[PDB]
Design a protein around this motif. Structure first.
Motif, PDB file in Angstrom:
ATOM      1  N   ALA A 100      10.075  14.123  20.712  1.00 49.43           N
ATOM      2  CA  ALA A 100       9.722  15.226  21.705  1.00 49.43           C
ATOM      3  C   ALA A 100      10.550  15.237  23.005  1.00 49.43           C
ATOM      4  O   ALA A 100      10.047  14.879  24.139  1.00 49.43           O
ATOM      5  N   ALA A 101      11.834  15.588  22.863  1.00 53.87           N
ATOM      6  CA  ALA A 101      12.738  15.717  23.994  1.00 53.87           C
ATOM      7  C   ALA A 101      12.189  15.859  25.462  1.00 53.87           C
ATOM      8  O   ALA A 101      12.153  14.883  26.197  1.00 53.87           O
ATOM      9  N   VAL A 102      11.901  17.065  25.951  1.00 51.81           N
ATOM     10  CA  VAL A 102      11.466  17.202  27.327  1.00 51.81           C
ATOM     11  C   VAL A 102      10.060  17.884  27.438  1.00 51.81           C
ATOM     12  O   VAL A 102       9.801  18.901  26.780  1.00 51.81           O
ATOM     13  N   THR A 103       9.139  17.333  28.204  1.00 48.09           N
ATOM     14  CA  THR A 103       7.787  17.975  28.289  1.00 48.09           C
ATOM     15  C   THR A 103       7.423  18.200  29.702  1.00 48.09           C
ATOM     16  O   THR A 103       7.637  17.301  30.522  1.00 48.09           O
ATOM     17  N   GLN A 104       6.871  19.383  30.004  1.00 48.12           N
ATOM     18  CA  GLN A 104       6.390  19.666  31.370  1.00 48.12           C
ATOM     19  C   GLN A 104       4.893  19.524  31.509  1.00 48.12           C
ATOM     20  O   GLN A 104       4.215  19.373  30.531  1.00 48.12           O
ATOM     21  N   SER A 105       4.374  19.565  32.736  1.00 44.87           N
ATOM     22  CA  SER A 105       2.949  19.523  32.942  1.00 44.87           C
ATOM     23  C   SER A 105       2.650  20.012  34.338  1.00 44.87           C
ATOM     24  O   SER A 105       3.268  19.477  35.261  1.00 44.87           O
ATOM     25  N   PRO A 106       1.696  20.982  34.499  1.00 44.15           N
ATOM     26  CA  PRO A 106       0.945  21.546  33.396  1.00 44.15           C
ATOM     27  C   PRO A 106       1.662  22.705  32.799  1.00 44.15           C
ATOM     28  O   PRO A 106       2.678  23.126  33.305  1.00 44.15           O
ATOM     29  N   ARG A 107       1.165  23.172  31.668  1.00 41.08           N
ATOM     30  CA  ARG A 107       1.845  24.261  30.929  1.00 41.08           C
ATOM     31  C   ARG A 107       1.571  25.628  31.570  1.00 41.08           C
ATOM     32  O   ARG A 107       2.508  26.447  31.718  1.00 41.08           O
ATOM     33  N   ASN A 108       0.331  25.822  32.024  1.00 46.97           N
ATOM     34  CA  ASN A 108      -0.165  27.083  32.485  1.00 46.97           C
ATOM     35  C   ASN A 108      -0.956  26.816  33.795  1.00 46.97           C
ATOM     36  O   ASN A 108      -1.890  25.960  33.802  1.00 46.97           O
ATOM     37  N   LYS A 109      -0.625  27.543  34.873  1.00 49.83           N
ATOM     38  CA  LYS A 109      -1.287  27.330  36.175  1.00 49.83           C
ATOM     39  C   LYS A 109      -1.528  28.563  37.037  1.00 49.83           C
ATOM     40  O   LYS A 109      -0.588  29.271  37.404  1.00 49.83           O
ATOM     41  N   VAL A 110      -2.801  28.742  37.425  1.00 57.10           N
ATOM     42  CA  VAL A 110      -3.262  29.820  38.329  1.00 57.10           C
ATOM     43  C   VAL A 110      -3.811  29.287  39.647  1.00 57.10           C
ATOM     44  O   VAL A 110      -4.900  28.739  39.681  1.00 57.10           O
ATOM     45  N   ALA A 111      -3.070  29.468  40.732  1.00 55.52           N
ATOM     46  CA  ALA A 111      -3.456  28.865  41.998  1.00 55.52           C
ATOM     47  C   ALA A 111      -3.529  29.932  43.079  1.00 55.52           C
ATOM     48  O   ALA A 111      -2.832  30.959  42.984  1.00 55.52           O
ATOM     49  N   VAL A 112      -4.354  29.698  44.101  1.00 49.26           N
ATOM     50  CA  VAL A 112      -4.549  30.667  45.196  1.00 49.26           C
ATOM     51  C   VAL A 112      -3.442  30.620  46.258  1.00 49.26           C
ATOM     52  O   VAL A 112      -2.852  29.590  46.512  1.00 49.26           O
ATOM     53  N   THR A 113      -3.118  31.733  46.875  1.00 50.97           N
ATOM     54  CA  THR A 113      -1.997  31.676  47.819  1.00 50.97           C
ATOM     55  C   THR A 113      -2.405  30.737  48.912  1.00 50.97           C
ATOM     56  O   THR A 113      -3.455  30.904  49.521  1.00 50.97           O
ATOM     57  N   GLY A 114      -1.600  29.698  49.083  1.00 51.53           N
ATOM     58  CA  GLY A 114      -1.851  28.653  50.106  1.00 51.53           C
ATOM     59  C   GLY A 114      -1.685  27.221  49.603  1.00 51.53           C
ATOM     60  O   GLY A 114      -0.796  26.493  50.054  1.00 51.53           O
ATOM     61  N   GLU A 115      -2.536  26.841  48.644  1.00 48.84           N
ATOM     62  CA  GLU A 115      -2.567  25.514  48.094  1.00 48.84           C
ATOM     63  C   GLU A 115      -1.224  24.924  47.727  1.00 48.84           C
ATOM     64  O   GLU A 115      -0.216  25.638  47.448  1.00 48.84           O
ATOM     65  N   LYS A 116      -1.222  23.602  47.696  1.00 46.53           N
ATOM     66  CA  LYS A 116      -0.025  22.818  47.444  1.00 46.53           C
ATOM     67  C   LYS A 116       0.115  22.592  45.946  1.00 46.53           C
ATOM     68  O   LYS A 116      -0.659  21.868  45.364  1.00 46.53           O
ATOM     69  N   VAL A 117       1.121  23.184  45.317  1.00 52.34           N
ATOM     70  CA  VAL A 117       1.260  22.928  43.903  1.00 52.34           C
ATOM     71  C   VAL A 117       2.455  22.015  43.503  1.00 52.34           C
ATOM     72  O   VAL A 117       3.582  22.265  43.912  1.00 52.34           O
ATOM     73  N   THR A 118       2.183  21.007  42.649  1.00 50.13           N
ATOM     74  CA  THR A 118       3.223  20.093  42.092  1.00 50.13           C
ATOM     75  C   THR A 118       3.521  20.206  40.568  1.00 50.13           C
ATOM     76  O   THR A 118       2.627  20.099  39.767  1.00 50.13           O
ATOM     77  N   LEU A 119       4.775  20.378  40.160  1.00 43.60           N
ATOM     78  CA  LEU A 119       5.046  20.445  38.699  1.00 43.60           C
ATOM     79  C   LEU A 119       5.739  19.221  38.102  1.00 43.60           C
ATOM     80  O   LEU A 119       6.834  18.948  38.462  1.00 43.60           O
ATOM     81  N   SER A 120       5.097  18.533  37.156  1.00 42.23           N
ATOM     82  CA  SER A 120       5.542  17.279  36.617  1.00 42.23           C
ATOM     83  C   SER A 120       6.301  17.463  35.279  1.00 42.23           C
ATOM     84  O   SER A 120       5.788  18.068  34.345  1.00 42.23           O
ATOM     85  N   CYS A 121       7.504  16.899  35.195  1.00 44.48           N
ATOM     86  CA  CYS A 121       8.351  17.005  34.042  1.00 44.48           C
ATOM     87  C   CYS A 121       8.765  15.595  33.631  1.00 44.48           C
ATOM     88  O   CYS A 121       9.041  14.765  34.486  1.00 44.48           O
TER      89      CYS A 121
END
Lengths: 109, 234
Positions: free
Chosen positions: A1-22
């Motif tokens: 399984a070469a490359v995987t991201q996390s999370p796959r699908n994300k719905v966040a409110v304008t403002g909050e701090k979002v982090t994408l893990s690969c």
């Protein structure tokens, strides 16, 4: 399984701090973080040659990245905004190679 | 002594279109710290590999530190020493090819001292004052702690910077609130030397080559030595 991201699908409110893990498994030096226009082409936000080092891509503005280990890279978003709403893709590249993640579908509302 | 720095003799943040996060990288709670160990190999006529393992993550099991020259290499080649330095990876090599990968490995410069009869009484730690100057004013002053009776300026410096990052945004992921800054040391005798904190005026930042300044393994006497940091706002 070469490359995987996390999370796959994300719905966040304008403002909050979002982090994408690969994370990788072929351990390639070069790792990349991408984003492309709604059904267009993929444009470079941030990349990295090696753990403990990133460089600004095409569209740096309004992102933070981090490479803490050869096989791991992350997209930081301090205060989100609907604009940043899209589909993100992660790649690693090396010895004649380039892998991609399955993409992260985001929503900034 | 090293004469006090000059205006245009200091690097300017405004001149670095690069990413100041690669500098933040080397001091936000990032160092290598080993105690009572001995070299276990070697590459060029001046670097001793140890078998020090990443405690925080899982990046390295070994650590190549490079010294000013060959005789400084031997001074420690087989002695029981301690370690305290900032490690990096991008361009951490062990052969001839310049951009090549390995693993369990990491590089640095300096940061070692003979362990024997250099630590304190019963684990007591020493405190080192730091006077901070923002635009020439003693704004903030704190202290740093170490176990050495004589320690690597590098150790001390790192510890300084790590605090300034953690409390005064000395470095931020895109840049820094400051235009210039240098960390100057004073030795009980009267030796005073300083080190620039800001990147080189241009587009990119070679992490490594910055650090190569720590290869003089220069040491100082905790209990007496005093520190000064000096900044100028944008």
């Amino acid at each position: 399984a070469a490359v995987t991201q996390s999370p796959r699908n994300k719905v966040a409110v304008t403002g909050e701090k979002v982090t994408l893990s690969c994370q990788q498994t072929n351990n390639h030096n070069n790792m990349y973080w991408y984003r492309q226009d709604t059904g267009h082409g993929l444009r470079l936000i941030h990349y990295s040659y090696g753990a403990g080092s990133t460089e600004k891509g095409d569209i740096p503005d309004g992102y933070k990245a981090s490479r803490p280990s050869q096989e791991q890279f992350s997209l930081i978003l301090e205060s989100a905004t609907p604009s940043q709403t899209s589909v993100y893709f992660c790649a690693s590249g090396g010895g004649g190679t380039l892998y991609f993640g399955a993409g992260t579908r985001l929503s900034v509302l | 002594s090293q004469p006090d720095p000059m205006p245009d003799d200091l690097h300017k943040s405004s001149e670095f279109t690069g990413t100041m996060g690669n500098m933040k990288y080397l001091y936000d709670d990032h160092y290598v710290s080993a105690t009572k160990v001995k070299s276990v190999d070697k590459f060029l006529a001046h670097d001793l590999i140890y078998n020090i393992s990443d405690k925080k993550l899982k990046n390295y099991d070994k650590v190549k530190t490079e010294l000013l020259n060959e005789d400084l290499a031997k001074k420690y080649k087989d002695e029981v020493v301690d370690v305290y330095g900032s490690n990096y990876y991008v361009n951490c090599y062990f052969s001839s090819k310049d951009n090549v990968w390995w693993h369990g490995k990491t590089c640095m410069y300096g940061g070692i001292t003979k362990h024997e009869g250099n630590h304190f009484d019963n684990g007591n730690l020493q405190n080192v004052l730091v006077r901070v100057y923002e635009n020439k004013r003693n704004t903030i002053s704190f202290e740093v702690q170490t176990d050495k009776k004589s320690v690597t300026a590098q150790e001390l410096d790192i510890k300084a910077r790590n605090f300034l990052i953690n409390k005064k945004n000395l470095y931020e992921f895109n840049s820094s609130p400051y235009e210039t800054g240098y960390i100057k040391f004073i030795e009980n005798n009267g030796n005073t030397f300083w080190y620039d904190m800001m990147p080189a005026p241009g587009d990119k930042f070679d992490q490594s080559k910055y650090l190569m300044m720590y290869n003089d393994n220069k040491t100082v006497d905790s209990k007496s030595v005093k520190i000064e940091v000096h900044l100028t706002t944008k």
